[PDB]
Assembly symmetry: D2
Homo-oligomer: 380 residues x 4
């Protein structure tokens, strides 16, 4: 049973009652009880459980080879729920190039709650060991990262976490369960911004979490019910729907990624390309050992900010917008958009050069995408 | 101008573009930018803002005579966002009768983050003054309370909070903006489980928050954006739709409440009755001075839990389920359902006895509701 | 038992499986079969049946005291389905004041299929008897009519239709089942533009049909299934939700209607007033004998079309738009908007003059609605 | 600009106002007018136009290389609207193996309206010429047909229709605009059951129509507005969404179709296979000349009804359900399901043998689909 089949038949996404081939949308808040505490299908209040959300949860658990799924109103909310597994005084290590909003949440919210943070370049696993204190309880890793796609050894970070008694969390958003399964490599918790590839259609903001640990799942459920950043039923339905085409979409995206990178490597206006598919990429071997495909986010550097802006205006099929994982291919300038608050000279130290472009490859025709970007690069 | 008109025309709930009479459902995650940083209507990512969510936010702000609305995935998520205004070491005062889940969240979650909580009988405002510690930063009041309907003097608690530098928060869920407007009495933040009267149809789980404080609004926006417990667009739409009928629904409910209370006060199988409309009810004067109506939540004592169970089975129009503020009239035993997370000995001390019944009066015919409940109580 | 209770508990609008208090939205097209021909709940293809559509159908059947409900994509589609009960050569009688689009559909579409139509002044039932041809198979009545609110004797027209073997159809859109129940007076089929009062929130375009005739129901089901103008599940859900508040909304509307009519009768810039509540209105006795209330549609004459235009601009709470039965109060000029498809000379003969204004009274405050309309008419 | 790009960027499917990357869902019934007849974006009533429906219409028009799109509540409703282009006395020719519901509508509804019908085996174009009377106004062709996939020469049928003054209609449902574009070959009107491949997710019942003829479009619009079988906004949104993945889905489906047919042709329990991809198939050359891909519906004959039933029970990834074009692969027995009313001996004359199986190939893994069906055929 291969992935494209599991996508279609994995999880519970039909109606046992009527036999509907799609998950009913339970736009509802409460459920009648036959007697006090006697729930006929286990439902009592939609913050606690909702049959549509339970459906999407079952899907994410199945695809990530876990036992328990959780759906939150945003990826940010999923991350918050996971971090609220810790107490004041606990210490968490994250990779240093973590997504802007994850950094913002750990440093201007959860530090105010007495949670200690260390940001570490996890491209070398031993930096994690250097960072481990006796109060360390959680290790949190994106791979690949935004926007330079730095790869981290998932299996090694799981071994480190196991031996030091840490909760290991991988943020699988850029790879999707279709290409990378952190739970299979020993990670405790895997989470996604379902806003991207999973939803797939730029029409749902949601986060998903999956684990095989029963006691971790029980704590996650308690947090979800007591802080309430749950995904609504309509968005859960749209998420299930979106996930159906995930394999086909990721494979189209990957075909275009490969051709686009060959174009970028051959082009003169491009000084450097960041993507784990490139054999000179740091930890390319590690990535190929922990995934059987690629993310569709690519970064490449052109000479300056005005060649970036000109590339944006010269493209016909790349769309200037926030986010990634859309059907549309998206384009952006991290120096002017996501990393604008970071000053110029320090963002050169960080790698966010003035001419760094990030594309999120969509499901348009591969030749249209390659050709369009190449003619734009020929205008420079 | 008048309340029933304000419900229809207050806030922005039409489409400027097409002239549509109802708020469009912007089931979307991202927005096109004309130039880098150039947003056509101020939208760039749906976690940050979404036109349908902004519609509901504008409605709740208008109705509570504040300046800023916020829509969360649940009332519990609104409460979480407000509590995250505090830091480790800060102390919060709440009133002694609180919704089960608010108690659970503050005592089993935010204490782990070093936030101190004390539950204080605010029916006498001066008890707040004694309870204020030097680390007290927030005062949080339900009024009337769930499930005993204890009244607290909102204007007095606002004066106290101003004089000691506390953020005053009122949880106006039971009264709705139709009858009670805490911001107009000096409160800093007003909160709702929009799951109840506002949504009105048992089909949306959501929270709403409103303030006139610009800097509190900015901190709330930062929290919502960094933890992501945002209300989705479909639920935001359904909330606006529901809020339209709010006045008509509350006025039916009040008509029915009056007759049901006279019935309960006269009935032999009914012991104590809890509702602020009763002249012997503690702080009844206070309630009539701060509200223009009554909540539809009523609590009353029967002899024991199995007389509760039999009363529940004998009713034909009261539905055994959690939550309140629906069109259906609802019935429950708070000790065994909504307030089970409150410890037993405290629930006995407070009066939330095993035979305490809570009804939420709906919009069915008043005579059907009175007769049905009375014929059922004649069974005991 | 009583109407306000029937609105809440009549029909099947809960989930038997999970106990959900609201009708699930079965956004689905097909259903699993356990064996060939073995349907788990009787569903096999969503054009034929859909559980959410069946929910709304059960509601309208219950409310109209019939046995069979039908949900169409629009009221016009319900009318089409009913007219398709006839064959080429059959003759239908309609009342002389009909909604613009019903006129357009019967005279510009179904005549091309050899269906003969005659518009007859049914305010005197005996005019029907003269109009009956040997090819007459159907009698079709709006009451009150759009936009002149002409009353027709429903019980008398049913007796006539029974005695001559005609299918009697009443278009109960203006009255709603809350106030008038044609099936209870012998009519065969009752029809609604559910777009109006039933939906209630200007957010659903839909039609509903109800009958107790088993064989008419079977022919209607065959027509709906073979021409496919079925109501979708999301709109069916929103219709159920809307119908919940129908009694409360109609009762507000009626309270406002009474005061607005006294204002209009007294105003100097207002000539004739059309509404069945007026004692001098033709067949006012008849209306009070067949209904327990009044529609919120009022028509009245101002001097000319530009006094209409100025009255429209001067109002603050009346909205210039098509349709009726919304929470917003609406205002229009039928001659130039809804009834423009009716030929001009017939519209002048009938009284649908260029200065005929139609308001649909909404649920805003009665005093705001009276004062606003009167201050605007003081402008002429 | 290749097909997979056109799918993503063809048509208007973003919000000009806010810049949302997806079509807003206009759950609304009416739109305010600035003055009488002055519509700010051309909208006045949602039966007439609705921005979400206008979006989907634009998509279908673009993909079929037409100028005008129309969205109906069902494919059946689209077909009815097209047939209502004719008048009593007009004559239409359809292919003899037309879909059950199209046959049912033409013969038990539209014949009652004086429309004459001839059902003709259009696999030889000259049978059309034999059938042409002087009253013939319309030619209506499915290709390939259900369930034996008979191919008809589209370009030739267009030439015949042009020379005899007929409205040519092709029912492109089985091929989708991705593989066959009848308008490009001279056909006047092309229609789809969007319930199948276009929607793609078994969650929308809808029909779509596309033409380049301005006067035909004007008539179609008049019919749509006066009979009202319009697609609702939520289903239009879901249709746009579904159409995004159409190319990827059709290509996966086609890869599996080819492998599955090689398996079926090689298997002993299979006596005969029906699919236009087979070179011995009647008019295979014609199909390859008018399409650049294949439908995913395949028929094959096994010995008897009990080998069909056993094949259904023995498969793990083929699902017994009505309809086609799902993500799930579907399986059925036409003799016992769609063609059950037709007697046994005459269905042998028709080709609907007792052992005829129809599969609708989904987007599961190709090897899982081939293997699963082959092991089932090895159980016979
Ligand atoms: C790992 C991870 N988690 C979370 C997120 C975001 O989570 P959420 O779904 O709440 O937006 C992102 C992406 N955030 O991008 C927004 C942008 O491109 O401006 C992400 O990469
Ligand atoms: C006063 C109050 N505030 C806040 C909340 C939290 O709201 P939410 O459930 O939307 O998260 C609730 C939730 N009540 O729910 C079940 C019940 O008591 O019958 C509440 O009652
Ligand atoms: C009495 C009546 N019946 C039937 C119908 C048809 O209903 P629908 O628009 O849902 O197809 C209508 C539609 N009215 O619409 C605009 C207006 O008159 O203000 C109607 O008024
Ligand atoms: C050409 C065509 N038009 C129309 C249709 C059906 O149109 P609609 O979308 O109204 O179902 C079909 C398929 N109908 O199948 C239903 C089934 O498999 O039982 C079709 O092939
Ligand atoms: Na399954
Ligand atoms: Na493990
Ligand atoms: Na307004
Ligand atoms: Na203030
Ligand atoms: Na019922
Ligand atoms: Na009868
Ligand atoms: Na476009
Ligand atoms: Na042409």
């Amino acid at each position: 049973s291969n992935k494209k089949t599991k996508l279609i038949h994995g999880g519970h996404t039909t109606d046992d009652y009527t036999g509907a081939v799609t998950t009913p949308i339970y736009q509802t808040s409460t459920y009648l009880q036959d007697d006090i505490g006697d729930l006929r299908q286990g439902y009592e209040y939609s913050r606690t459980a909702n049959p549509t959300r339970s459906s999407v949860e079952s899907v994410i658990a199945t695809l990530e080879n876990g036992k328990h799924g959780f759906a939150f109103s945003s990826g940010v909310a999923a991350i918050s729920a996971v971090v609220m597994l810790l107490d004041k005084g606990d210490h968490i290590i994250l990779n240093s190039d973590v997504y802007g909003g994850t950094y913002r949440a750990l440093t201007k919210v959860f530090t105010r709650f007495g949670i200690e943070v260390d940001f570490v370049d996890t491209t070398h696993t031993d930096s994690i060991v250097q960072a481990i204190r006796p109060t360390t309880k959680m290790l949190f890793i994106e791979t690949p990262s935004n926007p330079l796609l730095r790869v981290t050894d998932i299996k090694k970070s799981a071994e480190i976490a196991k031996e030091h008694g840490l909760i290991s969390v991988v943020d699988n958003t850029f790879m999707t369960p279709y290409y990378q399964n952190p739970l299979d490599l020993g990670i405790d918790i895997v989470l996604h911004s379902a806003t991207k590839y999973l939803g797939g259609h730029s029409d749902v903001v949601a986060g998903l979490v999956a684990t095989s640990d029963d006691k971790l799942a029980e704590r996650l459920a308690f947090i979800s019910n007591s802080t309430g950043g749950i995904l609504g039923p309509q968005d859960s339905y749209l998420l299930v729907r979106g996930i159906k085409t995930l394999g086909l979409r990721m494979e189209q995206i990957n075909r275009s990624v490969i051709e686009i990178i060959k174009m970028l490597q051959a082009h003169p206006a491009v000084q450097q390309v960041f993507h784990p598919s490139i054999e000179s990429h740091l930890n390319h071997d590690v990535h190929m050992a922990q995934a059987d495909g690629h993310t569709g986010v690519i970064a490449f550097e052109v000479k300056n900010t005005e060649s970036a802006k000109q590339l944006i205006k010269a493209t016909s099929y790349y769309t200037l917008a926030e986010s990634l994982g859309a059907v549309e291919s998206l384009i952006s300038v991290p120096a002017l958009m996501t990393h604008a608050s970071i000053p110029a000279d320090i963002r050169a130290k960080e790698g966010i050069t003035d001419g760094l472009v990030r594309i999120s490859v969509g499901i348009e025709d591969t030749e249209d995408l390659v050709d369009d970007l190449k003619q734009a690069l020929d205008t420079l």
